[PDB]
From a paper:
In this study, we determined three substrate-free PhoExo I structures using three crystals with different unit-cell parameters (crystals 1–3). Crystal 3 contained two PhoExo I protomers in the asymmetric unit. In crystal 3, each protomer of PhoExo I formed a trimer with symmetrically related proteins that were generated by the crystallographic 3-fold axis. Because the structures of PhoExo I in crystals 1 and 2 were partially disordered, we mainly used the structure of PhoExo I in crystal 3 for the images, unless otherwise stated. In the structures of PhoExo I, each PhoExo I protomer binds one Mg2+ ion among the β1 strand of the large β sheet, the α1 helix, the β4–β5 loop and the longest α4 helix. The Mg2+ ion is coordinated by Asp7, Asp80 and four water molecules in an octahedral manner. Because PhoExo I requires Mg2+ ions for its 3′-5′ exonuclease activity, PhoExo I is predicted to catalyse the hydrolysis of an ssDNA around this magnesium-binding site. PhoExo I forms a hexagram-like trimeric structure using the η3 helix, the N-terminus of the α4 helix, the η4 helix and the β11–β12 loop. In addition, Glu210 and Glu224 of one protomer form two ion pairs with Lys32 of the other protomer. It is noteworthy that two arginine residues in each protomer, Arg191 and Arg219, are clustered at the centre of the PhoExo I trimer, and the positive charges of these residues are neutralized by the negative charge of Asp189, which prevents electrostatic repulsion at the 3-fold axis region of the trimer. In contrast, the binding of a Mg2+ ion near the A site was not observed in the PhoExo I structures.
Here, we report the crystal structures of PhoExo I, which shares 76% amino acid sequence identity with PfuExo I. In this study, we determined three substrate-free structures of PhoExo I and four structures of PhoExo I in complexes with ssDNAs. PhoExo I forms a trimer in solution similar to PfuExo I. The 3′-5′ exonuclease assay of PhoExo I showed that PhoExo I cleaved an ssDNA from its 3′-end at every two nucleotides, and the cleavage stopped at the third to fifth nucleotide from the 5′-end. PhoExo I is predicted to utilize a DEDE (RNase HIII)-type catalytic motif for the hydrolysis of ssDNA. PhoExo I is a novel RNase H superfamily protein.
Residue numbers in the entry:
A (entry chain A), B (entry chain A), C (entry chain A): 1 to 227
Amino acid sequence: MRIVAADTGGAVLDESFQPVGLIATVAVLVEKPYKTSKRFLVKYADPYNYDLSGRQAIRDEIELAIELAREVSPDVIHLDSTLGGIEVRKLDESTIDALQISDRGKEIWKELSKDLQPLAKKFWEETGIEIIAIGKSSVPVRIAEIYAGIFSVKWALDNVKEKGGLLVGLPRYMEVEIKKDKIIGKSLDPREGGLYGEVKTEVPQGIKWELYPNPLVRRFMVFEITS
Amino acid sequence: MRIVAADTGGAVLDESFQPVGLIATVAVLVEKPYKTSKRFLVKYADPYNYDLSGRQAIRDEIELAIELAREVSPDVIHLDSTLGGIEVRKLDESTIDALQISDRGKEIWKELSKDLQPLAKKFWEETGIEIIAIGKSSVPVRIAEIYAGIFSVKWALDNVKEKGGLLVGLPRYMEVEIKKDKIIGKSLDPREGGLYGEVKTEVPQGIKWELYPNPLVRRFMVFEITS
Amino acid sequence: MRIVAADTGGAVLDESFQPVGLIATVAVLVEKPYKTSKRFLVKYADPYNYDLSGRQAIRDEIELAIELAREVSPDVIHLDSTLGGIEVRKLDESTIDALQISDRGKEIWKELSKDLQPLAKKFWEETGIEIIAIGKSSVPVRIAEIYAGIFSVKWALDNVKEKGGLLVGLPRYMEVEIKKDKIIGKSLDPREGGLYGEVKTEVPQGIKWELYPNPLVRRFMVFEITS
Ligand SMILES: [Mg+2]
Ligand SMILES: [Mg+2]
Ligand SMILES: [Mg+2]
């Protein structure tokens, strides 16, 4: 199978570890053995002006996934919404209320439906490719998320000399290593079977960084950097 | 404590990783230090003709557990249904509706009750041994599950030359190693404290195998083999 | 951030692994990098005369947290109740029923409210320090819990020659190592990012101990000791 997926991750935090906004939306192509991606797109948000409700993220995600899928012709697109793998082109109001999910989950999706259902329907008509609301069940979605963490660290590297110091909340239970002009991201959960990513990027001189637990959100790490 | 438990696991998958049917039901005897089993029974299903609803599995499980328990006289039997450890001989309709579980969980159990409650009651009258619906809380159930994964890999080894190629979905977050005429199965979750199993079986020549993440089901691995 | 947190853990078990009562309540001060504590208080319960409902634990916890906080002046106290981080001084009845939790969760808290809400309100008036019901989201709460496990092993060491043999159920997925007059406790979950604790205490001669899975409670270990 060849799968395109997308997710958003990486948060700028304040000094009390409260999220200000998110940093990176990433679309990935994933193929066997489904542990990493060698083909991906990133869109950087403005974390100092972000919508933390989930709406902005999923819209950026589905658009970036479609952008990558138009090029690499995957068998399917995985979207990060955990709805049991239903096709997004089928998500009209009546289908959404029938879903076995939360009522505010239904709130958000009945609002998203107006744009996303026609979008997925048109993309399917054009390409035959489904966009499925699989969410946390998807390994390609998790690989996208790990890359969003990696690209959030790239963003921190690229912005810390202007900003002085940054606190970046990473996606759940992942670490990064910074080597000579390379960031490697790895899941911390061995149950996931060895998921990772790598981005080549220039590491500036005159910086120091550290990775440690977010004390307010168990199993999430913080990347702290100063110049 | 000496505990008999049972579970079913291992799925034949198609090329899109969709489950066709399950492969192995295993009953284990587990004693201190509760990390593995050295005494077990296996029943192989026909995965190309299986009931994926859960009904077939739990019936095969309770029968195989009783078969092993009749020999090894455990203190208790653990059944893989997560109902808080209630004795199955007590599971009449009124008790089942009183349970703090899903209504389709109640659906399945009110149907199973007609056979399983009298079965557990009779076994208890004969032996004093309870059959408890403990499910995911039980370590012996997880050890049975790991052995079902192992025996599913044995089944793949034994059938791949006739079948040409096989995709086996393993139970959640476990790996296998194939050594000289031995399969070793291990949990991937260090939180479980080092659970494992081993089955001695002939490894055929002229095969190649690989273990990798199921991209559609996070934290589940696939064993792929060709001849 | 400087955080005080508390939790209770460690259970005396009978020979069928059933809990008799809990052993240690611990308050910790946690600072960057939020992996351990070097400043803590312990209160030992009488496990052979304990209230397993949760009431005794949370009362001992909030009092011990306040006792430590009065000395070390943390920015905040984390209490082990998972209510989304609401301030305990705000937990009147109407707020509790408004919470998005279980109805027996509301049962317990509407009873606790009569003492704990005025207590938290007074402490805040005195110090400006909030007591927040953050629960499982808190890393400092987990570090307190790991120390409760460690101190429960100290309690077992200190009592095994009078008791002959003890079975101690540890907090979820943690291990201990016993070195020369030191107990080291570590989380078994690498997703938590390397949480640990250490207590210096005399290890008696003429004992043997073992750590292994609790077969009735997956991902929880037992510390067994005899003299
Ligand atoms: Mg997401
Ligand atoms: Mg099962
Ligand atoms: Mg607690």
